[PDB]
Design an enzyme around this catalytic site. Structure first.
Site, mmCIF file in Angstrom:
data_model
loop_
_atom_site.group_PDB
_atom_site.id
_atom_site.type_symbol
_atom_site.label_atom_id
_atom_site.label_comp_id
_atom_site.label_asym_id
_atom_site.label_seq_id
_atom_site.Cartn_x
_atom_site.Cartn_y
_atom_site.Cartn_z
ATOM 1 N N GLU A 1 0.799 -1.225 0.000
ATOM 2 C CA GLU A 1 0.000 0.000 0.000
ATOM 3 C C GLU A 1 0.833 1.278 0.000
ATOM 4 O O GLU A 1 0.350 2.334 -0.396
ATOM 5 C CB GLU A 1 -0.996 -0.052 1.140
ATOM 6 C CG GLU A 1 -1.883 -1.274 0.930
ATOM 7 C CD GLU A 1 -2.714 -1.656 2.123
ATOM 8 O OE1 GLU A 1 -2.272 -1.433 3.272
ATOM 9 O OE2 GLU A 1 -3.804 -2.231 1.892
ATOM 10 N N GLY B 1 -11.129 -8.341 6.451
ATOM 11 C CA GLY B 1 -12.084 -9.401 6.139
ATOM 12 C C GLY B 1 -13.491 -8.922 6.457
ATOM 13 O O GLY B 1 -13.729 -8.393 7.534
ATOM 14 N N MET C 1 -6.106 -6.431 11.890
ATOM 15 C CA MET C 1 -5.125 -6.601 12.963
ATOM 16 C C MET C 1 -4.462 -5.308 13.428
ATOM 17 O O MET C 1 -3.608 -5.380 14.294
ATOM 18 C CB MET C 1 -4.063 -7.604 12.506
ATOM 19 C CG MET C 1 -4.613 -8.983 12.198
ATOM 20 S SD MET C 1 -3.399 -10.170 11.592
ATOM 21 C CE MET C 1 -2.403 -10.459 13.045
ATOM 22 N N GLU C 2 -4.841 -4.159 12.883
ATOM 23 C CA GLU C 2 -4.160 -2.901 13.222
ATOM 24 C C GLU C 2 -5.024 -1.669 13.465
ATOM 25 O O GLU C 2 -4.503 -0.667 13.934
ATOM 26 C CB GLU C 2 -3.111 -2.530 12.151
ATOM 27 C CG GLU C 2 -2.003 -3.551 11.934
ATOM 28 C CD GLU C 2 -2.321 -4.646 10.924
ATOM 29 O OE1 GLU C 2 -3.260 -4.503 10.100
ATOM 30 O OE2 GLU C 2 -1.600 -5.657 10.943
ATOM 31 N N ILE D 1 -8.315 -14.576 11.662
ATOM 32 C CA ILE D 1 -9.395 -15.518 11.961
ATOM 33 C C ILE D 1 -9.880 -16.226 10.700
ATOM 34 O O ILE D 1 -10.217 -15.576 9.708
ATOM 35 C CB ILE D 1 -10.582 -14.823 12.663
ATOM 36 C CG1 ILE D 1 -10.116 -14.202 13.989
ATOM 37 C CG2 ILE D 1 -11.733 -15.810 12.931
ATOM 38 C CD1 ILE D 1 -11.090 -13.196 14.548
ATOM 39 N N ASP E 1 -11.789 -10.280 1.771
ATOM 40 C CA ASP E 1 -12.348 -11.600 1.986
ATOM 41 C C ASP E 1 -13.781 -11.408 2.470
ATOM 42 O O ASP E 1 -14.113 -10.363 3.058
ATOM 43 C CB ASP E 1 -11.481 -12.369 2.987
ATOM 44 C CG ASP E 1 -11.938 -13.792 3.176
ATOM 45 O OD1 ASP E 1 -11.681 -14.652 2.293
ATOM 46 O OD2 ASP E 1 -12.558 -14.086 4.227
#
Lengths: 229, 229
Positions: A13, A79, A173-174, A153, A197
């Site tokens: 990114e 996700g 996660m961030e 997950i 996802d």
């Protein structure tokens, strides 16, 4: 204009941002690389967050406490949990929680610790600016609640449970960690996530290709935000 | 002497330090309180970390990046996994891992993310200093591996599993994150933990009383380290 931090949840990114900026310097600091560029009368500091809550907390804290960032824009992927969402949809977080911050043994709700709250909100002015940019670029942009934690997950039942507890639309996660740092340091934060996802769909596309295409869109998006700040 | 950060995992661990120091100032920053004192030709910055990985990462990053700490000493408590340990025993962490940092879906070991390692080490020179102080105070001090994560674990099966995976001697919510920040910023870190619960045993004692007594000992311990630095 104000000094702007641009954080990317993946190094991919940051690449298109640097390619557009062309002229930049860098420093190796905090076991990471921080890049410095001028854009449209703003000084920019850019970095890949590195993976997870601790890494992203550290990166955001460095950008503000060391490099003096006054606004922070955080691009990434997530996700999707909300069945209404589709792969590639762009979401901005209205608020975020840590689903794996758990002192429920002492009678607290999941995500809560004394001294803090369950949810952290992002900056309303930045979110409205993003809606303006989305309109100008003819890009569809939706609001959502993001749950953050240090697990990638795959368990569908766990995804459903996190959605239920927090009304979360997506997961990564961030986000919550960075939003918390920014709020604590009185720095407006914007969190942008492309859905990488969908819960309960087998992917059927290449992740690398998705990341490159989504990163191009997100890079242009955040530079357009910078131009208006 | 160098500027020294003293971080406490509970606010109760800071109180006896301030009582000994007597002359100090304090400010609000980063949604937390930071204290400043002179002690034995060292400038000190002190804080309660607040709870969990994000909070403690932020506090350590502020102490170093904003307040210029050159060494960091982190006192706290931990649940014992090693059967040989007893309530109140002092452990220093030789290395630490995050048990809840999990991208094992991609074939990595638990605790690992690309860009980092499973374990982070504390500073050997500080650990040797602590052994000297322990000897001079006639206090028993043991080395151990600490597992850190954002759950307060009460499930005995989960404790056994974390012990097995990491060969962990004890477990808490802030150690690995602070050790990582310090290593990344080239700041020597020392992590001291008093055992607040024992392997397989219901705690048959008052936590408040334990904290006050343990905090007094730990406060004197870290000030004696400061005196030798």
């Amino acid at each position: 204009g104000m000094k702007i931090a641009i954080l990317g949840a993946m190094s991919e990114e940051i690449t298109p941002l640097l390619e557009t900026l062309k002229d930049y310097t860098k420093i190796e600091h905090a076991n990471n690389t921080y890049y410095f560029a001028k854009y449209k009368d703003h000084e920019l500091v850019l970095a890949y967050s590195k993976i997870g809550k601790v890494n992203s907390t550290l990166s955001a804290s460095v950008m503000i406490e060391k490099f003096g960032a006054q606004v922070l824009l955080f691009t990434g992927v997530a996700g999707a949990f909300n069945p209404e969402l589709e792969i590639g949809d762009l979401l901005y977080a209205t608020k975020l929680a840590q689903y794996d911050l758990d002192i429920t043994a002492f009678g607290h709700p999941l995500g809560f610790v004394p001294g803090n709250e369950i949810f952290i909100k992002t900056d309303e002015k930045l979110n409205n600016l993003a809606l303006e940019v989305a309109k100008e670029l003819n890009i569809k942009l939706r609001a959502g609640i993001i749950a953050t934690g240090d697990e990638f997950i795959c368990d569908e039942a766990k995804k459903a449970k996190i959605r239920e507890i927090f009304n979360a639309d997506a997961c990564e996660m961030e986000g919550a960690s960075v939003a918390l740092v920014c709020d604590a340091l009185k720095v407006p934060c914007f969190i942008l996530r492309a859905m990488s996802d969908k819960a309960g769909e087998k992917a059927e596309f290449d992740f690398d290709e998705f990341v490159i295409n989504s990163a191009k869109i997100s890079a242009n998006f955040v530079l357009k935000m910078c131009e208006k700040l």
